[PDB]
Structure formats: structure tokens, C-alpha cells
Design a protein around this ligand. Structure first.
Ligand SMILES: O=C(N[C@@H](Cc1ccccc1)C(=O)N1CC(C(=O)O)C1)c1cc2cc(Cl)ccc2[nH]1
Ligand SMILES: O=C(N[C@@H](Cc1ccccc1)C(=O)N1CC(C(=O)O)C1)c1cc2cc(Cl)ccc2[nH]1
Ligand SMILES: *Cc1c(COP(=O)(O)O)cnc(C)c1O
Ligand SMILES: *Cc1c(COP(=O)(O)O)cnc(C)c1O
Ligand SMILES: CC(=O)N[C@@H]1O[C@H](CO)[C@@H](O)[C@H](O)[C@H]1O
Ligand SMILES: CC(=O)N[C@@H]1O[C@H](CO)[C@@H](O)[C@H](O)[C@H]1O
Ligand SMILES: Cn1c(=O)c2c(ncn2C)n(C)c1=O
Ligand SMILES: Cn1c(=O)c2c(ncn2C)n(C)c1=O
Ligand SMILES: Cn1c(=O)c2c(ncn2C)n(C)c1=O
Ligand SMILES: Cn1c(=O)c2c(ncn2C)n(C)c1=O
Lengths: 791, 790
């Protein structure tokens, strides 16, 4: 606990655990010694917490997800355990730099973006709320790839995060389980049997999840695939079974029907459900009480197979009758929808499923038959309603609509922001909500204020605590008390000072990683998120070039200097996203080297955007770019992180941006562009991109520069694919929000010129960010879906 | 003290395994104890390695593709003087230390004798305080686990690292890149090897505790890792990692697979680079290298080390060829482990040219200078050149790796007198003639820690009772046991120890096998890899022979036996697999014939490996060492049996010859043709049928086999054996059959006389001192590596 004992443990681990002394120990050795020193502090409570759940047997919550975008664990653990100050002191006394030790840790990047990071924030919140919750996923050998930029383009490198060892995971060999694939179904007089299957073992690894200052330490269980049991070739072929948990599919909001992805989904699902049933049978609590002891949240449709798998276990194995089994199943599962973009919908062809999971295909067909029998009985004449509500789309080569399977097999279905949940309920699944009104809900996303405030921005956390105490950490709504300081000049300077320090520290980072020199006086304009056409960093890029031309046309004009930062990873096979990245690095090259613009404007493509880098750049941001086309971003969470950390937002009325406006007051955000209904109008009328190109002189110059090679001289036609998409296939109407966006941007610079007014708006944003704590989000899930209670 | 060991155990169970006493598994308890013991190694491991850096003694590097280590827990407790205290602490915690010990997986990174010799050498070098390092590959899968299904061998992956190996320590800061393929460019800045594929080598260090001396050496094993459609590209990283994936399961047999060639270059490249790097940091240019480094090539498997050292000195360090070649020879020594043709490494130049273009050039260069010398010495002997070349144009050109090891080394040694002589005067006559002093002998040895103190505590204690403990570090001290030759009480005590071992092993046999063991029977044992040259087929002929005898005359006085035969067959060795099936078939008939009953039991010991050897050897009365004269280079199993109180029935082959010299030929049951008789028969021509015709007991056995007596459901099952036996038996099974059976009868005779039997046993044990690997290592240190015990 105290400094002396922490130093003693550190030296002890460096010695016995790392087998080193101070003259031969590497930096990595020191990081590992500290990690083990911190990890030791988790054990007692990890054991008690899990023992407690067995004793008092509260209802358990299982968050089933193919992704857990955890980031680093060291600092997060020290903070939630109240050990950071002591460890900082101990490490300092040992003559070491704790910051350096922390940078040695690899991010556990087992996620693509929002969906995976939401799972991570939820685990922190559920532990902080004292819920008997478990995270269940896959332990990928390789997470989201490390991004490099070569000659302006994205290059992918394997994310070998486990190469040096992960001290934060605990193998649980005694819980290994067999998972089945392929084979065939036999309908015997003893029950249908699934036989001649190939077997792959599932080895679980537990990672502790410390609640914030509360003695609760929950568990995240990730499964790894292992082979069971010419000789050499046979041994090498063991790689095939093990490839199942080998790599995270690098796609964000995009469906790719590869068989290996289907294997991963069944793998997690099968291992997870069996483990859950086994723990249920040992609870010394037949399966009638199951739904009162178990809640399983389906994170998107990725784990949809859990439904037919639970049915398979209840029926084929436990011999329960179908009706009883189906009843228990619905009461067990709840489904969370995370998107409305067509390219992201999971639709598995029945042939692939038939080959890999013959018995699940049969169970799904059965589910679908009973389902449609009901509709036929309710709307005998609506024949097309049946076609629309079926789990099977015969529309060409038959496929399974996984979202529909999740809806019929779940008692609750929720979206992740009001605007989104509404669209899901009344438009996308109108036929279903009409039948079961009460089944559809909304649960607006949230972020954990531990990692995204206390951890990433200690200066702000301290300043806030200075003024209003520490209650806000566990009750973020407490930030409204900050309103008492609206006219407090001294406080406003203190707030600005914290942002300035964060910017200074991040600028140091930028100068050492990039050739560029940073004007620390500039406004940090930031857009960090996965590269997507719908998120439109392309629009941001149009505005950047626009500011460039303005400086060239009139260099002596008064101008608020900016440092424009854009970062994010493109899915490997997403060609347009890769072109967009190259467009940004090209533009940056011209801008950063034009002697006429100089320190007026700097552009940086932030490489390898991931959780640990987000913790650095967000606290250093002044302007947060949240410009997705109205109706495309289901919720967003980066928007919330920026709001909590003192940045103002420039964005569309989309996803949770709408709620950030409700809480803070629309005028305290720079809202702009078409709204959901305006986008529909343009669609109805038909979008003619050329018209804006024609009518907007600044837009036309930008476009022409791009298309003629102004930014790619050595290859004039390089950006032709973008031009063509922009003029003839822009599903996201980049040109249609261009004018309002730029006008809006000008207004931002205006406000920035007035520090007191700017920080006054910042204060209103921070003071109103309380609704976005994931602790609030989780309370709502616990109360209205899982029916469990905080402790 | 016990109290502190219990406290550490509980501490590790808690913080390290995250368990308490009601949820802890047996495996958790084994791991808690292992960490508790491992902690005791640290201080000395660090000091020992620091010491080598400070005083900078000359270092010895044992480069081997195999290290058949077995289990580490007990060996560590013993060499550290901690066994009694840990036993007591575990007992007090209400646990069974024996159960905990059986949890540990063997580190089976070897096939047999060659790999186990490397392990015994490490223990001895550490006990002698030498600055020695073992260098090899960290295979993900060692020698396969053997199962017997419907009488046949079935192989299962040996996933020894699945639950974690607490005995290894990753050394990430010493990772190195190894190169493959590419092409050679001869520039004006030196020849460059370019466009190569790169595979990383990650070293893992395992501590090697000397016996009671504060020395803890290192065994460094390399693991392959890939450097740095997207998904497919990530999955293909498996290809680079496949290099250190599986140990080739062949014992004394060459298989020219490209992956095996990759493994050999992999160990060699990573090892030589690491050695040079450690040399450059010694604050001791490369002139002193051979005075600071000795590298022992364990067989020709690491032969590439020679051209690789040349490549580094020349292509990289820019040293002139003559200087580089001089340093190289002073650095390497080569150990020959066999004369069997099928085991010689001959890589086709095409494969080497593709995978290692630069090494092929260096080898050609070495060969050119080599032959230039011979041409200058024997201008008219044109065929001498053909015989001494590193290249065999005899069809598709190939590289004779043994020849490369000889020209690139300053010393070449065999592993037993009879073997070393054959190597020097016959196989490499042309080379030894030129460099007489280059060829030596270093008779193999076994470590008396694992093979006596550990595996047979009863014997170790009995012996210490009579002569003190000096024998542990000076095994020659066992000769003091001669003072008890007439001591009746001692002879009963000796027999009692053997009886307890047999009792304990019989328990094992009954629970694993259906069979009921007559604990009164003589344990006749043949455990080693299944080979035609080791002839367990001959043993099988004798077994059937005894069977027929019991059937012909059931009421005759007969010494009862429990015949045990065990060993693994290389997966692709068809004959060996047939031989196994023949043995299990024979056993089926014998064990179930009501007429033989408890007179004779036959057991095929499944999954023979280091940890099982430690169980069955101490329980043996008769040790079968019957290879054809001139085929077993040395053997080491023979030595383990001698040390543990078993008598030997064998041919005058390998080290059996020296066991006879030490104990007195009459105290061993020697039989069969000798090296020269085998040659005579070869010259005259071996006509297997003649013995079949002339020996009525042999004929009946053979007919039974060939007609389906042992395979009724399939009469022609053993046809391949019959045909090999009559027309292609390179090992003359029939030609030693008569003497073997006569010899066997004499064994039973002696067994009937307990006092006479144990009197001979005592003479075997008292004379086993020469076979301690400690003696072997002293000889290598003095005459090859030029290093000194400390
Ligand atoms: O592996 C040891 N310590 C561990 C310490 C560790 C544990 C978990 C994560 C990181 C580090 C170690 O160095 N690693 C496990 C990692 C891997 O599997 O790659 C790297 C170890 C200590 C030790 C001490 C002695 Cl005396 C002998 C063998 C030993 N191994
Ligand atoms: O892995 C831990 N201990 C290690 C301890 C260990 C190390 C080496 C051999 C056996 C056991 C562990 O259990 N294993 C490493 C093996 C593997 O590679 O599969 C199994 C560990 C302890 C711990 C304590 C907390 Cl609070 C959180 C995570 C933790 N992991
Ligand atoms: C929060 C977060 C996201 C999601 O950001 P949006 O802007 O909401 O898409 C993506 N990646 C990382 C690393 C994050 O921390
Ligand atoms: C010693 C040993 C060997 C060598 O046996 P030989 O009979 O000398 O061939 C082979 N395997 C194991 C497991 C051993 O311990
Ligand atoms: C398929 C997918 O990744 N959906 C994403 O989910 C997160 C978390 O709900 C939302 O914030 C975001 O708007 C949405 O694009
Ligand atoms: C190539 C090979 O494995 N050779 C083996 O080596 C061991 C160790 O020297 C000898 O005892 C044995 O007779 C021999 O068959
Ligand atoms: C979002 N996204 C992708 O992620 C993607 C893609 N094509 C390939 N990938 C990987 N497309 C067209 C796409 O819109
Ligand atoms: C690396 N890279 C790309 O990734 C790429 C490309 N053109 C299109 N793409 C997607 N070019 C020319 C290129 O060099
Ligand atoms: C019938 N048979 C064989 O004939 C055989 C074998 N292994 C090797 N052979 C030759 N096995 C396992 C087997 O069942
Ligand atoms: C020793 N041995 C083998 O190990 C072997 C073989 N054929 C295949 N293998 C694997 N032969 C003929 C052989 O003698």
C-alpha cells in the first residue's frame, strides 16, 4: 500500500520474477516489475468478489461480444485501486520514470472502434456499480493492426500484442471446453444428434476488471482456440484449428461473410453458453429459474448464434420441450442494435451455415416457422409482411438476416441514442415493434469517467475536484454544480490553463513523431475515429484545402491559427478510405511546407489511432469534429470524450450529438448542416452533386485542385476515384453540407478569438456532460433490461 | 527451513496462481511448489553468469538440435539440497508431493540417446563448474506421446507448453533475425546476401543447477517468430513460426526435408550471432576468439555452423579468408554418433543452393582449398580426392555433412572405444591419416544425479550407508563397494532395494495394463527406440521360444519372467511399426494362455520417455543390450541399468565392451557374433535360411509367425517381417539366435541362485564408476575445449 512496501515488492519482482538486477534490467523489465507489483493488489479482492457472487448468488449479467477494446491496464488499475500516487512516488524514488514504464505496455486492441470500446467502458462501469457482471469474448492473438503511413498511404502491420507476455491475463485451464463444427445431424429415437463433428478446444483466459474504489473486481473471460489431443504435416495442421482465435477482423461497420468469421462467432458463443450453463448448475441454487439467474446481452448481431445454440442445449441435450426452451431463451437474451448502415448488416448465406452448423440451420428454420405461423394467424392477408419479417431472405441466394433472429429470440432490443433507437423501432423494424411495442427501447451510450477523465486528464479532474469535491467521479451528474462558476474569471483562466498544459504536452509528442513544428498558440481542430465515407473526414479535408487557398489569396489577413489533426485506421480492404487517407497526407504535405502559410496552419495525420493515443490527443483538443451525415452515426462516443475534456463540438444533428445539444443547450455547440429530414428530402428529389460544385466558387477551386493534380503533381489522376465518387456516387452528400460546414467553421474561429467567451461555452459543455457517463447507461440497462441491482 | 518453504508456497498459490485451498487444483499445487523452488535458483543464476563476465573464463557452447531434459522439479530440489525440506513442507500442508511431481510434463526435446547425452552433459558441466551453455531449439512440440491402439503405435501431439513452463525465461532483449533464401551479389564492398526472407529467433533461458555447488548454468533454446489479403497474410505468419514447431521424430535416420534444413540453419545462425555478440561485449579483434570460445557440434545436424562462422568473419567482419578459416577450426569440435548409412546427412546441393546460396558458395570454397591440399600431397591418387570431397557427384550432387564437420573442426570424437576406432581407421581413414591427432574417443556417460539419486533413492541411500556420499561427485568411489562381496547381510539389503523398486513398478503396470504381475519373476527389460539394428525382434524370437517351451512341458521347473519391451517407432519407420505389432500380438497370446499363467508375462511398455525410464530401470533385473556387433555406437541405457542393479545380456558392441572391461567380462552375459565375425559372414554372404533349417526351435517360432499363430484373423499380417528376415536382414537376427537363447538359459540358471546373482550385481554396481558423465565431461574439457573444472 505505502511507498516503502511498494518499492520492496518492485525490487522483489524485478529479482525473482524478471531475474534481473538494476544494471542489466531493461525498460520492459521495469514495466513488468511494476505491473506485477500492482497486479498483486488485485488478487485478494478478485477472489472475494467472485466468492461473494457464488455465496449470495445475485443474478449475473453476461456481456457477449466479439470485441473488447481495452487499451492499456496499468494506469487504469492503479487509479481504480487508489494506488497511483503511491506508485508514482515509489517509482520516482527508485530513480525511474513511471511515464516511460507506462509507454512500454501494448494496448489490448481487441476491437475496431465504437462498438468494442463501448464494451470496455461497460465493464468498468458494471464493476464500479458492483454488478455481478462478466465480459465474454475471444482472445485474438492479433488485435486491430498497427497502422503505418508510407509514401502517404496506410500500410498494415501485425499487432503482435502478446509477444512479450500479458501479465494481465490468467489462464483457466480447468475450464477448457470442446466446441463442435461441421459434422451432420441424425434424428434418432433418443433425440436429434449432431455427429461426426470436428472439435476445437476453447481455453479461457481471465482478466480482472477493477471497479473504481470499491473492492469489486469482476472478470473478462476471453477464449483462445486450441487443437484437441504424414506425422509432421498433421502436427503443423493444428494451426488450422488455432487460426479461429488468431486475428480480429479489421472491419468497422461493414459485413464480410468469410467462413472464418462465422467460425469465430460460433466459437465464442458455444464456449460461452456452455460455461454459463455449467456455472448455473453449480450455483447450488430445473432450468426454470435460469432467466432469473442469467441475463445475456448480445452486443450487435455478431453473437446472434447464441440464440439457436441455447435452444440446441436445452432441447438436444437437456431434453426440455421446445415451447419451454423457447420461453426460457427469450427471457435470457436482450439484443443491442449498433447501426443502420446496409453494408454493416449480417446476412449469412444458408449454404455456408448449413455446411458449418447443420443443426443450427435446422433450429433457425424451426424458429422461423413458428414465427411466421404467428404472423399468418394475425395478418392472414398481408402476404408481403411475412416476406419482410422472415429470418430468411430468398432474394437471390438465400441468407439469414441475423438482426431478425436476434429480435425474435430476445425480450428486449435497444438502440444506442434516441434518434437511433427511434429509427430502429419505427422504421427498420416497424413490423416487429408494431407487434411487440414494449420490446424496443433506447439506452443512450456512455463513456467511463475513470479512463476518460481521471486517467487521461488528471489536470482537469483535479481542477474540477478543487471546486466541487469528488462525488462527481461516481455520480457524473454532479458536474452541473460547475455552473456556479460561469462568471468566475479566475476559474475560467484555470480551465484554459489546464487545456494549455495538455496541448503543450501533446505538442511535444507531435514534434518528436512528426517533422512538423507546432504553433502552441493555435486552435487544435481534431477529427479522430475510423476512416469512413459516412464519418466524412473527406468533408473536413475539403475545408482544410479551403482555408489553405484563403491564406494564399490573402496572407496578411487576420486569421486564428489552427493545427488540424485527423487520424484513424482504414479497414484493409476499404479502398475509398485508403484513398481518403492518401488525400489527407498529400494535402498536409503542401500545407505544412508552403512558406506563405507557415505557422498559420499545420496539418497532421495522426498515425495508429487507438485507445492509448486517444487518451493523449483528446485532452489537448479545442475543436471536436463530429460531422457524420445526419442519420448515419447511430450514437458516437468519441463526441462524448471530447465534451468531457474541455473541447467544443462542431457537428451535425446526428446520433448522440443531438443529446449533447439537449443537455448543454444547442447554442453551446456548433451545429450545422442537413438534419435527418432534410437528407430524406434530398434523397427523394435526387442528389445532384454537380450543382453545389457549380454554385460554390470555393468548393469548385478545391475540387479542381484535387482533380488536376495540385496535391499529386507526380501523378495528376491519382485522386480520380474520389472525384468520381464525389460527383456520381456520394451516398453521404459531402457537397450538400459543405457550405453550412464552412460557414459554421468561420463562426468557430470567431468565438476562439474571444478566450473568455470560448471558455465560458466550454464550461457549459463540461458542466452538462454528466448524462454521458457509462455509469448512467449501465443503471438503465440493469433496471429496464437485465433486472439486476447496483451494489 | 520448512516454515519458510510453506510460507512461500502459500504466497505463490495466492498471488501467482490466484487460488485458495478449496479451489486450488492439483496442477495449481504443482505450480506453486515449482515457483517456490525456482525462487531458490535466482540468486545463484545471476551470480554465476555475472562471474563468467567478470573473470572471463573460456566458455563452452554445446550446439545441439536436441536436449532430452525430462522433468525439472525433483532434479532442482536435489541439486540444490532442498528435497528433504520441501518434502516436509508439502507433507505438512497436507499434500502428496509425489502427486504434485507427476503433474509436470517432460521436456521431451530429444529422440533418444543423442538428446539425453546432451542433457546429462549440461548437469555435469554445471556440477564441474564449467562456463558452459547449451544451445538448441525450443520446439512447441517435443517427441510425440505414444499410445497403443489395437496393438499398434498411435502418435499424439506432445503439447508440453499448453499449461506453461515455469522453468523457462524469455530473454526478449536478445532476439535476433535469421535469413533464408535470397541471392548472392558479389560487389566491390564484399559479397552480399540479399532479398532474403527474415524469421526472428527469440531465446528462452532455462537454469541448469550444478549438484550442490552454487553454480547455475544456462540452456538457451530459440523459438521462431515472424517479423513485424490482410487476414491471410496474418495467418501466414504461421509459416515462419513452423520452423521451431516440432521435433523431427527420427532416431538414427536421415530425412532430407526442407523444414529440417531450416531448423538446422535457424539454431546455428541465431547461436553463432549470439556467441559473437557476447564475445564483443566481454571487454576481454577476433584473434582471442578461440581462447574464449569452444563450440561442440553434437553430430552433423549443426554442421552449417562452420560455413556460417566463416560467413560472419568474412562477409561481415571483413576478416581475410585464411585468418577466418584458422579461427574457425580452433573454435569447433565435432562428435560423431553413428556409422549406420541411413543416418548420414547428405543434403542435395540444389536445396542448399535455393535456401542458403551464400553457404553453398562458402562450402564449395572450403572444399576447393581442401582438395588443393590433397592434390599437393598425393598427386597421383585421384580417387582419394573423390573420397575426401565434401561433395558427392554420385548421381544428384549432395553435401557430405560429416566431411564438412571434419575439415572445419580441430577435434573429432566417437562415443565409445570400439566406435571411435571404427570412425578413425575405417570411415575416415583418409582424414585421420592426414591428421592423426585430430581423432579422439570420449566414451559416453550418464549423470548419477538423475540416474541414481533421483530415480533410485533406495539404492543411493543403501550405498551411502556403506561408503559415504563422496561417490555422488566421484562415481569411481563405487569401487569401495567391493569390500562387501562376502557380506551376506548387505547382499540381502541390495536385493531388498530391487524388490521394493519392482513392487512399486508392478503397481504401475497393473493399473495401466490388464495384466497381473508375478512380483516373484525376473524383470527382463528392453527399452530403447524401436530399430532393426537394436533387434527387439530377436528378443521377440526368444519370447516365443520360451512360450513354446512352457506349452511343450508345463510341469518343468522354470524361473518365471516378466518380459518388458518398450520404445517409440519413428512415424514413417514401417518395419519398426510391424515389429511393435508383432510384440503386442505375441504378448496377447502369452498373457492369456491358461497353461503359461504366471510363469511368463509380456508387456509392451507404452510411451517410453525419460520420466518412465526413471521408473522402469530401477525395477530391472536383466538388461537387454543386443544390437548387432558394430551397430550401436555407444549406448547409454546400458549404463543406466548397470548403475541400478541389473545384470546385462548383450553383444560385444558399443560401450557394452567397456562395461565388460570394467566389471569383468564374466560378470555380464556376453553372447553372439563379435565385430570381426559379422564381417566374415558378410564376406561369405549371409544365408538366413540355413539357421531356419538347422535350428528346430527357431523354425517353429518362424512358422508360427508366418502362418498366423499370432494373427489368426489375418494369417499373412507379418509377411513383411518374414521376407525381411529371410532375404533382407542387414542385422543378421538368425545368426545370433542360437547363442542368444543359450545365453538366456544361463541367465535363468544364475537367477535361481540369489546370492550368486546379487554377488554379480554388486560387481556391476561397484564397477560402474567410469560411466558417470562427469568423467566424460572432464575428458572433453581437458582434451578438446581446453577449459578447467572450478
Ligand atoms: O518466465 C519467467 N517470468 C515471466 C514474468 C512475466 C509474467 C507475465 C507477463 C510478463 C512477464 C516472464 O519473464 N515472462 C512470461 C512471458 C512469456 O511467456 O513470454 C515473459 C521466469 C522467471 C524465472 C526464474 C528462474 Cl530461476 C527460471 C525460469 C524463470 N522464468
Ligand atoms: O498468469 C498468471 N500466472 C501464471 C503463473 C505460472 C507461470 C509459469 C508456469 C505456470 C504458472 C499462470 O497461471 N500461467 C502462465 C501459464 C500460461 O502461459 O498459460 C499459466 C496470472 C496471475 C494473475 C493475478 C491477477 Cl490479479 C491477474 C492476472 C494474473 N495472471
Ligand atoms: C471512442 C473511440 C472510438 C469511437 O469513436 P467515434 O468517433 O465515436 O466513432 C474509436 N476508436 C477509439 C480508439 C476510441 O477510443
Ligand atoms: C537413455 C535413454 C535412451 C538411450 O537408450 P539406448 O538403449 O542407449 O538406446 C533413450 N530414451 C530414453 C528415454 C532414455 O532415458
Ligand atoms: C457496427 C458499429 O460499429 N456501430 C457503432 O456502435 C457504436 C456503439 O453503440 C456507436 O456509438 C456508433 O455510432 C456505431 O457506428
Ligand atoms: C545419431 C544418434 O542418435 N546416435 C546415437 O547416439 C547416442 C549418444 O552418443 C549413442 O549412445 C547411440 O549408440 C547412437 O545410436
Ligand atoms: C465501410 N466499408 C468497409 O469497411 C469496406 C468496404 N469495402 C471493403 N471494406 C473492408 N466498403 C465498401 C465500405 O464501405
Ligand atoms: C499503397 N497504395 C495503396 O494502398 C493504393 C494505391 N492505389 C490505391 N490504393 C488503395 N497505391 C498506388 C498505393 O501505392
Ligand atoms: C491394419 N494396420 C496396418 O496394417 C498398419 C498400421 N500401422 C502401420 N501398418 C502397416 N495400423 C495402425 C493398422 O491398423
Ligand atoms: C531407422 N529408420 C527410420 O527411422 C525410418 C525408416 N524409414 C522411415 N523412417 C522414419 N527406416 C528404413 C529406417 O531404418
Amino acid at each position: 500500500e505505502n511507498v516503502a512496501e511498494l518499492k520492496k515488492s518492485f525490487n522483489r519482482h524485478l529479482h525473482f520474477t524478471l531475474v534481473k538486477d538494476r544494471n542489466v534490467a531493461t525498460t520492459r523489465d521495469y514495466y513488468f516489475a511494476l505491473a506485477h507489483t500492482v497486479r498483486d493488489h488485485l488478487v485478494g479482492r478478485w477472489i472475494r468478489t467472485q466468492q461473494h457472487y457464488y455465496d449470495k448468488c445475485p443474478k449475473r449479467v453476461y456481456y457477449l461480444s466479439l470485441e473488447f477494446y481495452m487499451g492499456r491496464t496499468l494506469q487504469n488499475t492503479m487509479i481504480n485501486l487508489g494506488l497511483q500516487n503511491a506508485c508514482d512516488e515509489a517509482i520516482y524514488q527508485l530513480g525511474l520514470d513511471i511515464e516511460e514504464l507506462e509507454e512500454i505496455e501494448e494496448d489490448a486492441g481487441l476491437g475496431n472502434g465504437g462498438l468494442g470500446r463501448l464494451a470496455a467502458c461497460f465493464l468498468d462501469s458494471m464493476a464500479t456499480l458492483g454488478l455481478a457482471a462478466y465480459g465474454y469474448g475471444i482472445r485474438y492473438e492479433y488485435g486491430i493492426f498497427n497502422q503505418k503511413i508510407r509514401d502517404g498511404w496506410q500500410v498494415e502491420e501485425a499487432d503482435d500484442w502478446l509477444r512479450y507476455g500479458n501479465p494481465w491475463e490468467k489462464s483457466r485451464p480447468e475450464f477448457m471446453l470442446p466446441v463442435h463444427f461441421y459434422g451432420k445431424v441424425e434424428h434418432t429415437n433418443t433425440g436429434t444428434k449432431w455427429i461426426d463433428t470436428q472439435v476445437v478446444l476453447a481455453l479461457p483466459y481471465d482478466t480482472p476488471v477493477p471497479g473504481y474504489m470499491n473492492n469489486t473486481v469482476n472478470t473478462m473471460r476471453l477464449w483462445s482456440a486450441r487443437a484437441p489431443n504424414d506425422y509432421i504435416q498433421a502436427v503443423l495442421d493444428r494451426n488450422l484449428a488455432e487460426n479461429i482465435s488468431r486475428v480480429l477482423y479489421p472491419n468497422d461497420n461493414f459485413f464480410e461473410g468469410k467462413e472464418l468469421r462465422l467460425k469465430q462467432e460460433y466459437f465464442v458463443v458455444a464456449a460461452t453458453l456452455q460455461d454459463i450453463i455449467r456455472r448455473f448448475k453449480a450455483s447450488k441454487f430445473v432450468f426454470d429459474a435460469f432467466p432469473d439467474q442469467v441475463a445475456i446481452q448480445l452486443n450487435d448481431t455478431h453473437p446472434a448464434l447464441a440464440i439457436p445454440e441455447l435452444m440446441r442445449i436445452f432441447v438436444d441435450i437437456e431434453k426440455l420441450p421446445w415451447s419451454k426452451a423457447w420461453e426460457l431463451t427469450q427471457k435470457t437474451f436482450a439484443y443491442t442494435n449498433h447501426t443502420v448502415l446496409p453494408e454493416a448488416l449480417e446476412r449469412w448465406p444458408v449454404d455456408l451455415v448449413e455446411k458449418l452448423l447443420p443443426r443450427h440451420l435446422e433450429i433457425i428454420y424451426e424458429i422461423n416457422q413458428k414465427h411466421l405461423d404467428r404472423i399468418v394467424a394475425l395478418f392472414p392477408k398481408d402476404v408481403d409482411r411475412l416476406r419482410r419479417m422472415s429470418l430468411i431472405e430468398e432474394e437471390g441466394s438465400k441468407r439469414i438476416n441475423m438482426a431478425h433472429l436476434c429480435i425474435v429470440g430476445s425480450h428486449a432490443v435497444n438502440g444506442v441514442a434516441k434518434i437511433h433507437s427511434d429509427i430502429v423501432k419505427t422504421k427498420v423494424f416497424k413490423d416487429f415493434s408494431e407487434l411487440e411495442p414494449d420490446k424496443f427501447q433506447n439506452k443512450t451510450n456512455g463513456i467511463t469517467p475513470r479512463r476518460w477523465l481521471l486517467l487521461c486528464n488528471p489536470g482537469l479532474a483535479e481542477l474540477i475536484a478543487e471546486k466541487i469535491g469528488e462525488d462527481y467521479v461516481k455520480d457524473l451528474s454532479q458536474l452541473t454544480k460547475l455552473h456556479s462558476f460561469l462568471g468566475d474569471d479566475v476559474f475560467l483562466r484555470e480551465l484554459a490553463k489546464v487545456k494549455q498544459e495538455n496541448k503543450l504536452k501533446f505538442s511535444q509528442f507531435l514534434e518528436t513523431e512528426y517533422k512538423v513544428k507546432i504553433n502552441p498558440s493555435s486552435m487544435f481542430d481534431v477529427q479522430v475515429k475510423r476512416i469512413h465515407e459516412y464519418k466524412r473526414q473527406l468533408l473536413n479535408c475539403l475545408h482544410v484545402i479551403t482555408m489553405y487557398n484563403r491564406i494564399k489569396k490573402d496572407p496578411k489577413k487576420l486569421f486564428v491559427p489552427r493545427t488540424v489533426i485527423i487520424g484513424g485506421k482504414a479497414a484493409p480492404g476499404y479502398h475509398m478510405a485508403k484513398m481518403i487517407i492518401k488525400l489527407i497526407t498529400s494535402v498536409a504535405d503542401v500545407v505544412n511546407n508552403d512558406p506563405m502559410v507557415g505557422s498559420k496552419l499545420k496539418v497532421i495525420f495522426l498515425e495508429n489511432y487507438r485507445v492509448s493515443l486517444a487518451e493523449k490527443v483528446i485532452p489537448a483538443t479545442d475543436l471536436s469534429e463530429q460531422i457524420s451525415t445526419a442519420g448515419t452515426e447511430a450514437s458516437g462516443t468519441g463526441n462524448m470524450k471530447f465534451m468531457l475534456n474541455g473541447a467544443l463540438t462542431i457537428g451535425t444533428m446526428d446520433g448522440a450529438n443531438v443529446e449533447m445539444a439537449e443537455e448543454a443547450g444547442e447554442e453551446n455547440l456548433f451545429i450545422f448542416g442537413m438534419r435527418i429530414d432534410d437528407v430524406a428530402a434530398l434523397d427523394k428529389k435526387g442528389y445532384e452533386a454537380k450543382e453545389y460544385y457549380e454554385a460554390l466558387p470555393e468548393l469548385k477551386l478545391v475540387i479542381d485542385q484535387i482533380d488536376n493534380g495540385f496535391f499529386s503533381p507526380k501523378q495528376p489522376d491519382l485522386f480520380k476515384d474520389i472525384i468520381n465518387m464525389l460527383f456520381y456516387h456520394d451516398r453521404f452528400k459531402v457537397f450538400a453540407d459543405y457550405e453550412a460546414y464552412v460557414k459554421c467553421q468561420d463562426k468557430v474561429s470567431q468565438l476562439y478569438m474571444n478566450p473568455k467567451a470560448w471558455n465560458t461555452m466550454v464550461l457549459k459543455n463540461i458542466a452538462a456532460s454528466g448524462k454521458f457517463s457509462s455509469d448512467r447507461t449501465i443503471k438503465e440497462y440493469a433496471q429496464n433490461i437485465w433486472n439486476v441491482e447496483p451494489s
